[PDB]
């Protein structure tokens, strides 16, 4: 039986699914860890105890407990990111799409979802790996991990809530793939992990963490990097937020043991209800429970690891979208709304800058303001809006990524950088939002190949082009087809710093992505805030 696979953890039975007038095998809901429930909440994951009998892997598993976006009820633009399955703390499962007939030893790609470490599901329609598994002949795996306080509550020193357990969930899933993917026809020595935003940051964190390095061959980071102002906190800040969470739930705060005991007795939704009250500043693009620089998963500060080359040396493919910050301004910045063009007044622009750079003093804010303001026309609502959009994307995604790429390439074995600037023709979000954060994903997963989804013929060509770059990179460490007549995606080098745009137009090569603004964010502003 092509749908029956015997693994080291036990037997599993998948289901046959249709895809682009053909079919492939799908094994959904495979458990890789013991349910992290009860006294196991906030604790490191435990491997799933082997089972006798056949595990039914015909349907999607539950999604981890998380905040649910209800800012636009019934709107597909936002609900397509929400959990589409019931939520439960019993959520540590992985899904696998296997070509048919089953391969013997083919390239494997493991997807790590984003969601600011506070949300995300492996079951979203936009993450369906059948199109990619079928089109590129790869074994596509999508894992899951605890988010919110459930996966990142951090009380360093404690052994009940050490922090980073969400990252350990990811690692345990990677370990499972390492040990069992061969049974599904995948090559465990040719595993590429890829993810977007928080998932991209996660990928970078596995590149850094010694305990994850041996579990994969190469990586792809989309709109995310480990060094991002929002992807991690110090052990002290992690502790402060954990304590504050307890304070919000009337917990005994006399000891970690007591705090944890109290937090474990609360219902999931109780923690989620007050999750956002623990942020230290009024801000956007900042999440409460994220990875912590603890000295375990991360030996030293991320910057010192990057400077000394203390990370896995392999090939990486990464990039960003043109308008990473628009989503976050819509949800929290004054003056922005979904049904208007969101032309911003000078006043709202000022408020936006403050929300975007919470760690900056007045001089720092003046610096950012000066850098992104057209003083010949500073009341221009469109320029104010776009300027704010750039500030958010540059500070939170692009410049941190450019810093990572510059540091990684010094020791790496091959870097490929892209700039995705094509807005989907069928995007339901307003036009002012541009090439939105996360909207390159549908292209990576081949949704444009599905007629009923209504993408242009050109967009279908882009998706196929992108999927082939990704899969070819996963397979060989180079996105370019050897001896092909296609345009070549040049390697990114310290010297030339080349990258390509990813859109429906003929591929063009550029250099020094966002270098002017990133020198400001990566070199100048930090010096300024330090000197003042």
Ligand X SMILES: *[C@@H]1O[C@H](CO)[C@@H](O)[C@H](O)[C@H]1NC(C)=O
Interacting partner of 436 out of ligand AT3, ligand X, Cl ion, none (Cβ under 5 to 8 A depending on kind): ligand AT3
Among 255, 307, 413, 494, binds ligand X (CB under 6 A): 413
Asked about 437 being catalytic, the answer comes back as: yes
Do residues 146 and 36 lie in contact, with contact meaning Cβ atoms separated by under 8 Å? yes
- Residue closer to ligand AT3 by CB (options 99, 120) is 120
Closest CA to 116 of 407, 358, 438: 438
Interacting partner of 59 out of ligand AT3, ligand X, Cl ion, none (Cβ under 5 to 8 A depending on kind): ligand X
What is the Cα gyration radius of the chain?
A: 22
DSSP 117: T
Closest CA to 108 of 80, 143, 64: 143
Interacting partner of 69 out of Cl ion, ligand AT3, ligand X, none (Cβ under 5 to 8 A depending on kind): ligand AT3
How many of the chain's residues bind ligand X (CB under 6 A)? Answer: 5
494 near ligand X, rule: CB under 6 A: no
Cα 92 from Cα 142, distance rounded (Å): 11
Cα 57 from Cα 76, distance rounded (Å): 28
414 near ligand X, rule: CB under 6 A: yes
Pairing of strands 54-56, 10-13: parallel
- Residue closer to Cl ion by CB (options 104, 267) is 267
- Residue closer to ligand AT3 by CB (options 99, 115) is 115
Q: Among residue numbers 204 through 243, which ones bind ligand AT3 (CB under 6 A)?
A: none
Asked about 142 being catalytic, the answer comes back as: no
Q: Among residue numbers 58 through 117, which ones bind ligand X (CB under 6 A)?
A: 58-59
379 near ligand X, rule: CB under 6 A: no
Is residue 514 left, alpha or beta, with left meaning phi > 0 and alpha meaning psi from -120 to 50?
Answer: left
* DSSP secondary structure string for all residues of 507-525: P-EEESTTHHHHHIIIIIH
Q: What residue is closest to Cl ion based on CB?
A: 269
The region of 56-64, 184-192, 401-409, 416-424 touching ligand X under the rule CB under 6 A is 56-64
Among residues 121, 223, 437, 460, the one annotated as catalytic is 437
Among 32, 55, 81, 176, binds ligand AT3 (CB under 6 A): 81
Asked about 79 being catalytic, the answer comes back as: no
For residue 444, the SS3 value is helix
Interacting partner of 327 out of ligand AT3, ligand X, Cl ion, none (Cβ under 5 to 8 A depending on kind): ligand AT3
* Least distance in angstroms from the C-beta of 332 to ligand AT3: 6
Residue 3: both structure tokens together: 């749908």
Dihedrals phi, psi of 516, to nearest 5 degrees: -60, -55
Among 383, 437, 498, 514, binds ligand AT3 (CB under 6 A): 437
Among 236, 258, 276, 532, binds ligand AT3 (CB under 6 A): 276
* Least distance in angstroms from the C-beta of 327 to ligand AT3: 3
Dihedrals phi, psi of 6, to nearest 5 degrees: -100, 120
DSSP 345: P
Closest CA to 307 of 423, 438, 408: 408
Map 322-340 to HEC letters.
CECCHHHHHHHCCCCCCCC
CB atoms under 10 Å from CB of 246, counted, come to 24
The catalytic site residues sit at 197, 324, 437
Where does this chain bind ligand X (CB under 6 A)?
56, 58-59, 413-414
Where does this chain bind ligand AT3 (CB under 6 A)?
69, 81, 114-115, 120, 196-197, 276, 327-328, 331, 436-438
């Amino acid at each position: 039986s092509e749908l029956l696979v015997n693994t080291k953890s036990g037997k599993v039975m998948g289901t046959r699914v249709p895809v682009l007038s053909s079919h492939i095998s799908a094994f959904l809901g495979i458990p890789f860890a013991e349910p992290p429930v009860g006294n196991m909440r906030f604790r490191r994951p435990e491997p799933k105890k082997p089972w006798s009998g056949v595990w039914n892997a015909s349907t999607y598993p539950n999604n981890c407990q998380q905040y649910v976006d209800e800012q636009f009820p019934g709107f597909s633009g936002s609900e397509m990111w929400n959990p589409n399955r019931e939520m439960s703390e019993d959520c540590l499962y992985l899904n696998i799409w296997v070509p048919s007939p089953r391969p013997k030893s083919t390239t494997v790609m493991v997807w790590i979802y984003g969601g600011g470490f506070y949300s995300g599901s492996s079951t979203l329609d936009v993450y369906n790996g059948k199109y990619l598994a079928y089109t590129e002949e790869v074994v596509l795996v999508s894992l899951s991990y605890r988010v919110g306080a459930f996966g990142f509550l951090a009380l360093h020193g404690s052994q009940e809530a050490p922090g980073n357990v969400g990252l350990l969930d990811q690692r345990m899933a990677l370990q499972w793939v390492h040990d069992n993917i061969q049974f599904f026809g995948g090559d465990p020595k040719t595993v590429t992990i890829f993810g977007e935003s928080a998932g991209g940051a996660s990928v970078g964190m596995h590149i850094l963490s010694p305990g994850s390095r041996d579990l994969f061959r190469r990586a792809i980071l989309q709109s995310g990097s480990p060094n991002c102002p929002w992807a991690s906190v110090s052990v002290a800040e992690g502790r402060r937020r954990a304590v504050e969470l307890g304070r919000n739930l009337n917990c005994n705060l006399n000891s970690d043991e007591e705090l944890i005991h109290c937090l474990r007795e609360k219902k999931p939704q109780e923690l989620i209800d007050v999750e956002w009250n623990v942020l230290p500043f009024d801000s956007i693009f900042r999440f409460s429970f994220v990875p912590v620089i603890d000295g375990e998963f991360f030996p030293t500060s991320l910057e010192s690891m990057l400077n000394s080359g203390n990370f896995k040396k392999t090939q990486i493919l990464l990039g960003v979208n043109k308008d990473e910050g628009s989503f976050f301004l819509l949800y929290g910045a004054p003056g922005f709304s979904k049904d208007s063009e969101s032309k911003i007044s000078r006043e709202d622009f000022m408020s936006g800058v403050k929300l975007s750079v919470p760690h900056a003093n007045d001089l720092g804010l003046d610096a950012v303001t000066l850098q992104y303001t057209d003083w010949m026309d500073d009341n221009n609502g469109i320029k104010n809006r776009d300027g704010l959009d750039d500030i958010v994307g540059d500070h939170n995604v692009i410049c941190p990524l450019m810093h990572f790429v510059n540091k990684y390439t010094k020791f790496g074995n091959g870097t490929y950088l892209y700039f995705f600037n094509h807005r989907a023709s069928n995007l339901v979000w307003p036009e002012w939002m541009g090439v939105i954060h996360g909207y390159e994903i549908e292209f990576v997963f081949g949704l444009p190949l599905v007629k009923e989804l209504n993408y242009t013929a050109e967009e279908e060509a882009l998706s196929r082009r992108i999927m082939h770059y990704w899969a070819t990179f996963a397979k060989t460490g180079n996105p370019n087809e050897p001896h092909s007549q296609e345009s070549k995606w040049p390697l990114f080098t310290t010297k030339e710093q080349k990258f390509i745009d990813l859109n429906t137009e003929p591929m063009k090569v550029h250099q020094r992505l966002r270098v002017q603004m990133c020198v400001f964010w990566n070199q100048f502003l930090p010096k300024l805030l330090n000197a003042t």
